[PDB]
Design a protein around this nucleic acid. Structure first.
Ligand SMILES: Cc1cn([C@H]2C[C@H](N=[N+]=[N-])[C@@H](COP(=O)(O)OP(=O)(O)OP(=O)(O)OP(=O)(O)OC[C@H]3O[C@@H](n4cnc5c(N)ncnc54)[C@H](O)[C@@H]3O)O2)c(=O)[nH]c1=O
Ligand SMILES: [Mg+2]
Ligand SMILES: [Mg+2]
Lengths: 413, 553
DNA sequence: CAGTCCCTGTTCGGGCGCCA
DNA sequence: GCATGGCGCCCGAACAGGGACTG
C-alpha cells in the first residue's frame, strides 16, 4: 500500500530512547519470538544491527478469554519526547460527554495501525531487542516499518482514516460517543445494556469491512462514586480518640478552610491519660457536627487544567481495600475513589495494586482523556519484579515510588 | 577478505578523527609488533598508508594465556569519544547451571575473530596507526585497519552481531542443535549419536569457513573435561576452574579488592561465602596501593572462607521436567545465603545476597529483597521463577504483610526450620494501654548552634529534659522517645508530634546504621507493651504543649 | 511565601572479579 | 603516554524530594 507517510518531527534537541531490555520468562520469550517472526515476514518490522543507538523494552501479555499472546512495547519514553507531535500538531479531541454515558466499552483497534507505513527517518527510534534465555545468544534487534502500537503518534497519524472509517457509523447512530486513546477505542452510549452490546457488535463488523482484527468489562461512568472523608461515631470519647480526631481535622483543614478545632482542643488541656474517658462537652458537640457538615458538601475550588500533569496517589488499607485520589495540585482533588476487594483477585497485594492502577488509568482516560502519573505505595524492586506478570492493559502510565507511613491513620478510609 | 557485509559507522557531528601521537615502546614489543603487522599486511587485514592520512593512534602489545605470543591492541580511547554510539547486544552471561544434559557435546572458537570481519570502508582512515623502528632512529610505517581492531568500542558489538547472522541459517536448518555463542566461543550440544554429532560439527565448522571464519583445531573435541566460560563442564556436573586466593602478609587496598572479587565468583557455587567484614575495610576513600591493616573481624572471614574453598564442590545440570527450589538461610547480620536445586541435595547453583538497603530495616524486609533477587536471577537463567523454602513462619509473614503499609509479596513458598529464624522482634499496640503511665515526648534544637533539648512529661507527674550537643530537630525527636522508653516499665504509652520518628518506629526495624536508633530498638524489645500515638505539632493539644515549652527554652 | 536544613532514597562511576 | 563490550558486587558522591523550621 504505497502511501505518503506524514513526517514525524521530534522535540528539538531530543535524544531518542535508549532503554535496556529486561529479563523475560520463557513462556513470554517464546511468545514474542513467534509473534515477531511472522511480523517480520508480513513486513511490519525489519531486522537491524547495533549501528542504531536507540532501544525500547518489549514484553508480552495474555489477556482475558484471549489465548493468543499480545506484544507490548514500552514506548512510554519515545512518547515523552514526541509529545510535541501528537498533542499539539496532530492532536485528537476529547469528548467531555463520555464521562456521562450509561455504558462504555473498550475495543482493541490497535491492529488497524499496522496498515499505515511509518516515516523512514523516524523508524530508527522504534528499535527494540529480544532477549534469549540464559543468554544462549545476543539480542536480536528489530525496528518498525509501520505505525506501531503503543506509540502515541500512531493513533494520531491514523486519525484521518479513522474519521472516515467511522463516518457512516456516526451518521446512523448520532447518539453514541467514540473516543480514540492509543490502541484503545472507547464507545459510549445511554442505550440499554443488551442493545448497547449489539451496537458494539455492529461497529465491530463495520471495522471488519475494512480489515481490523478486533478480538465485568463494560464500563459505567455514572456508577463511579467520588467517596469523601468521614469522621467516626463513638458513644464515649477517650483522650486518645479526641486526639486522633484533631489529628485528622487539622489535616483535613488544608482542604477546607472552614473546619475549626479550637473548641475540641481545649478538651485535652493538661497532661492526661490516653485511656481516660472524657465527657462529650457542648462547645465541642456543636463544632464537631459543625465540621461534620463541611465534609459532606463538595469541596469548592475544583477545576481541571489541561495544561498541567495529572497525579494519582493510592493508599493501602487492608482486607483488600485501596483508596486513591487524582489531582493536579495538592489539596485540590479532582476525584477520590475506593477500590474494593475485587472478587476473584488472589491475596497478592501486588496483583491487587496492579489492578487498581489500571482502573484509575481507565477512569482517568474517560474523564480527561489523559493518563495520570502514579505515586505507588510499594517498593521499586518489589513492583519492578512482578508488575508485568499481572498487567493487562495496552498502555503504561508513568509511575514513581513513594514510601510514607500513615499519619492520622487513613483519613480517606 | 570476508564477504560478510560491513556495518555503516559514522563519527559524532563536528568531530574529526584522532590525532594522538604514538608513545615509545620496548625493544621486544616493537619486535613482536612488526612481525604481526607484516603478517596482517599480506593477509589483507591492514594496509600501508600514504602521508596524506593526518590521523594516528598509539598502539601496544600484551601477552596471552600461555604467553607464547602477543595481542596487538590499540588505545582508541580518543577515537571512542568521537565515534558514534552503539546499542550493545550482549545482554548477559550464560551459566552452566542453565545447561541441559546432552548425548554429545563439542566447543569451538574462531581463531583471530575480529581480524575476519570487514570494517566499514569510510571509517578505516581514522583507525590509522604507526609502528616505530628499533630505537626510533628511522621513520616508521603508517597503517590502517580494514578489519575490526581491538580497542574500538564498536568491535565487540559488531562482531557478536555479525556472528549470529552467520549462524542464523545453520541454526534454522538444524533446530535440533543448541548452540551457545559468546563472542567467537561456540558450544554445540545435541542428543545425536556420538558420530553423527562429529558430522554436524564438521558440517558447521565448514559453514564458518565459507563466511571467512577460521576454526583452529585447538578446541574441545570429544573432551569430557570441557573448558567453557571459566568452568569445567563434565558429563553430569560442572565446576569452576581452579580458584586461587591471594595469600600475603601485608594487604593493600587493591589486594583486598582482588580478594573479594574472587570470593564472590566463588559464591556462585561454594555456599556459605561471606565478605561483609572484608569489604568494610574498603570504607572511606582510599588508594589502590594504600596498605591497610587486616582487621580482626575480617581475619575471621578471610580465614573462614579459605576453609570453605579447601573442600571442592560441583554443580549439577537443569531439566525442564522438574520444578526449581531455592532455599535460603541467614548467615550473618545483614548477610544471606541461598542455593537453587531440583532434587534433595542435587545443587544447580548457590548464591549470596548482602545489600543492607536503607538506614533502617528488618530481617523480613531484607529477606523479601533476597527472594526478589533470586527470583529475577533465576528468570534469566531458566526463564521461570522457582519455589522457595524460607526460614520464616507462615504466621510471621502474614502478620507483616497485613500490617505493613506498603504492598508486599512473596511467591510460592513453604516453611523450613533452620536457625537463625526470621521474625519480628516486637509489635506496637493497636489500641492504647489501659492503666499505664503515658509519656508525652518531644524535643527541639536551634539549627543555628547545634544545641538542643529533649524530654518528656507524664500524666503521673514524671518529667525530664536533657541538654544535647551536635543534634538536629529530627535526632532530638528520636532521642526524646529514647528517654521515655528507658524511664518506663514493661508497658508504656508514648505520644509525639514527630512524624519522622513515628515513621521509623512503626516499620518495626530491627537493625540500623544509627547508634540512637539501635538503642531505641533494643529498648523496645525489652518492653511488653508499647503504643506510640501522633498529634499535630504546634497545635494547642493537651500534653504536647507543655513538653514543647520545656524543650525550647 | 521563599529559602535552609536534614534525612533518605535512587543513579551513576570507579575498581575488582569472571568471559571474550 | 598500558584498549574494548558484557555481567556481578561494594562503596561513595551527586542529585532529587518532602517535611519542619525560620525570617
Ligand atoms: C581475550 C581478549 C579478547 N578480545 C576480543 C578480540 C578477540 N578477537 N580477536 N582477534 C576476541 C576473542 O579472543 P580470543 O582469545 O578467542 O583470541 P582470537 O579470537 O583473537 O584468536 P585465537 O583464538 O586464535 O587466539 P590465540 O591466542 O591465537 O589462541 C588461543 C586460543 O586457542 C584455544 N586453545 C588453545 N589450547 C587449548 C586447549 N588445550 N584446549 C582448548 N582450547 C585451547 C583457546 O580457545 C584460546 O582462546 O575477543 C579482546 O578484545 N580482548 C582480550 O583481551
Ligand atoms: Mg578465538
Ligand atoms: Mg516539637
Amino acid at each position: 500500500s504505497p502511501i505518503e507517510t506524514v513526517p514525524v518531527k521530534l522535540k528539538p534537541g531530543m535524544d531518542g530512547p535508549k532503554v535496556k531490555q529486561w529479563p523475560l520468562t520463557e513462556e513470554k520469550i517464546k511468545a514474542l519470538v513467534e509473534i515477531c517472526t511472522e511480523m517480520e515476514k508480513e513486513g511490519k518490522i525489519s531486522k537491524i544491527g547495533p549501528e542504531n543507538p536507540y532501544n525500547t523494552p518489549v514484553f508480552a501479555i495474555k489477556k482475558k478469554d484471549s489465548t493468543k499472546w499480545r506484544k507490548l512495547v514500552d514506548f512510554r519514553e519515545l512518547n515523552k519526547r514526541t509529545q510535541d507531535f501528537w498533542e499539539v500538531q496532530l492532536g485528537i479531541p476529547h469528548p467531555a460527554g463520555l464521562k456521562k454515558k450509561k455504558s462504555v466499552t473498550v475495543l482493541d483497534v490497535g491492529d488497524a495501525y499496522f496498515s499505515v507505513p511509518l516515516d523512514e527517518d523516524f523508524r530508527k527510534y522504534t528499535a527494540f531487542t529480544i532477549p534469549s534465555i540464559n543468554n544462549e545468544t545476543p539480542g536480536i534487534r528489530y525496528q518498525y516499518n509501520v505505525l506501531p502500537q503503543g506509540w502515541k503518534g500512531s493513533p494520531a497519524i491514523f486519525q484521518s482514516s479513522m474519521t472516515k472509517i467511522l463516518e457512516p457509523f456516526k451518521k446512523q447512530n448520532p447518539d453514541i460517543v467514540i473516543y480514540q486513546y492509543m490502541d484503545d477505542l472507547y464507545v459510549g452510549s445511554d442505550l440499554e445494556i443488551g442493545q448497547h452490546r449489539t451496537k458494539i457488535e455492529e461497529l465491530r463488523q463495520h471495522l471488519l469491512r475494512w480489515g481490523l482484527t478486533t478480538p465485568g468489562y463494560e464500563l459505567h461512568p455514572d456508577k463511579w462514586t467520588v467517596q469523601p472523608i468521614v469522621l467516626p461515631e463513638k458513644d464515649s470519647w477517650t483522650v486518645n480518640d479526641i486526639q486522633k480526631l484533631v489529628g485528622k481535622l487539622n489535616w483535613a483543614s488544608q482542604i477546607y478552610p472552614g473546619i475549626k478545632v479550637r473548641q475540641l482542643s481545649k478538651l485535652l488541656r493538661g497532661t492526661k491519660a490516653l485511656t481516660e474517658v472524657i465527657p462529650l462537652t457542648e462547645e465541642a458537640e456543636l463544632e464537631l457536627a459543625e465540621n461534620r457538615e463541611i465534609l459532606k458538601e463538595p469541596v469548592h475550588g475544583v477545576y481541571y487544567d489541561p495544561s498541567k500533569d495529572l497525579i494519582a496517589e493510592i493508599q493501602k488499607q487492608g482486607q483488600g481495600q485501596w483508596t486513591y485520589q487524582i489531582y493536579q495540585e495538592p489539596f485540590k482533588n479532582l476525584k477520590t475513589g475506593k477500590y474494593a476487594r475485587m472478587r476473584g483477585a488472589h491475596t497478592n497485594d501486588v496483583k491487587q495494586l496492579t489492578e487498581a492502577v489500571q482502573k484509575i488509568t481507565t477512569e482517568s482516560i474517560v474523564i480527561w482523556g489523559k493518563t495520570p502519573k502514579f505515586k505507588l505505595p510499594i517498593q521499586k524492586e518489589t513492583w519492578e519484579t512482578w508488575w508485568t506478570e499481572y498487567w493487562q492493559a495496552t498502555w503504561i502510565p508513568e509511575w514513581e515510588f513513594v514510601n510514607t507511613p500513615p499519619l492520622v491513620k487513613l483519613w480517606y478510609q | 577478505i570476508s564477504p560478510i557485509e560491513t556495518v555503516p559507522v559514522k563519527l559524532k557531528p563536528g568531530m574529526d578523527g584522532p590525532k594522538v601521537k604514538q608513545w615509545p615502546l620496548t625493544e621486544e614489543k616493537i619486535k613482536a609488533l612488526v612481525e604481526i603487522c607484516t603478517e596482517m599486511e599480506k593477509e589483507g587485514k591492514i594496509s600501508k598508508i600514504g602521508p596524506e592520512n593526518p590521523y594516528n593512534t598509539p598502539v601496544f602489545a600484551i601477552k596471552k594465556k600461555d604467553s607464547t605470543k602477543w595481542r596487538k591492541l590499540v588505545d582508541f580511547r580518543e577515537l571512542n569519544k568521537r565515534t558514534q554510539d552503539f546499542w550493545e547486544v550482549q545482554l548477559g552471561i550464560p551459566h552452566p547451571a542453565g545447561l541441559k544434559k546432552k548425548k554429545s557435546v563439542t566447543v569451538l572458537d574462531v581463531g583471530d575473530a575480529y581480524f575476519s570481519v570487514p570494517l566499514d570502508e569510510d571509517f578505516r582512515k581514522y583507525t590509522a596507526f604507526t609502528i616505530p623502528s628499533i630505537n626510533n632512529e628511522t621513520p616508521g610505517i603508517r597503517y590502517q585497519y580494514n578489519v575490526l581492531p581491538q580497542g574500538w568500542k564498536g568491535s565487540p558489538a559488531i562482531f557478536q552481531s555479525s556472528m549470529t547472522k552467520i549462524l542464523e541459517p545453520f541454526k534454522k536448518q538444524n533446530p535440533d542443535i543448541v548452540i551457545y555463542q559468546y563472542m567467537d566461543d561456540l558450544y554445540v550440544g545435541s542428543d545425536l549419536e556420538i558420530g553423527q554429532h562429529r558430522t554436524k560439527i564438521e558440517e558447521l565448522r565448514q559453514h564458518l569457513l565459507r563466511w571467512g571464519l577460521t576454526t583452529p583445531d585447538k578446541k574441545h573435541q570429544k573432551e569430557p573435561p570441557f573448558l567453557w566460560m571459566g568452568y569445567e563442564l563434565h558429563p553430569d556436573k560442572w565446576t569452576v576452574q581452579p580458584i586461587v586466593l591471594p595469600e600475603k602478609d601485608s594487604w593493600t587496598v587493591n589486594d583486598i579488592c582482588k580478594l573479594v572479587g574472587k570470593l564472590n565468583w566463588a559464591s556462585q557455587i561454594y555456599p556459605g561465602i561471606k565478605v561483609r567484614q572484608l569489604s568494610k575495610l574498603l570504607r572511606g576513600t582510599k588508594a589502590l596501593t594504600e596498605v591497610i591493616p587486616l582487621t580482626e573481624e575480617a581475619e575471621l572471614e578471610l580465614a573462614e572462607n579459605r576453609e570453605i574453598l579447601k573442600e571442592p564442590v560441583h554443580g549439577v545440570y537443569y531439566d525442564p521436567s522438574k520444578d526449581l527450589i531455592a532455599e535460603i538461610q541467614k548467615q550473618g547480620q545483614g548477610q544471606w545465603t541461598y542455593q537453587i536445586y531440583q532434587e534433595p541435595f542435587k545443587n544447580l547453583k548457590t548464591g549470596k545476597y548482602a545489600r543492607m538497603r536503607g538506614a533502617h530495616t528488618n530481617d523480613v524486609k531484607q529477606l523479601t529483597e533476597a527472594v526478589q533477587k533470586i527470583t529475577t536471577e533465576s528468570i534469566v537463567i531458566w526463564g521461570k521463577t522457582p519455589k522457595f523454602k524460607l526460614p520464616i513462619q507462615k504466621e510471621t509473614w502474614e502478620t507483616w504483610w497485613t500490617e505493613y503499609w506498603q504492598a508486599t509479596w512473596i511467591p510460592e513458598w513453604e516453611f523450613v526450620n533452620t536457625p537463625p529464624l526470621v521474625k519480628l522482634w516486637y509489635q506496637l499496640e493497636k489500641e492504647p494501654i489501659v492503666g499505664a503511665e503515658t509519656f508525652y515526648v518531644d524535643g527541639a534544637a536551634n539549627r543555628e548552634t547545634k544545641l538542643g533539648k529533649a524530654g518528656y512529661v507524664t500524666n503521673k507527674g514524671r518529667q525530664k529534659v536533657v541538654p544535647l550537643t551536635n543534634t538536629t530537630n529530627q535526632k532530638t525527636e528520636l532521642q526524646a522517645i529514647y528517654l521515655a522508653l528507658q524511664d518506663s516499665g514493661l508497658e508504656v504509652n508514648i505520644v509525639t508530634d514527630s512524624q519522622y520518628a513515628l515513621g521509623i518506629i512503626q516499620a518495626q526495624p530491627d537493625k540500623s546504621e544509627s547508634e540512637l536508633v539501635n538503642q531505641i530498638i533494643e529498648q523496645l524489645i525489652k518492653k511488653e507493651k508499647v503504643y506510640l500515638a501522633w498529634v499535630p505539632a504546634h497545635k494547642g493539644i493537651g500534653g504536647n504543649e507543655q513538653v514543647d515549652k520545656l524543650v525550647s527554652a
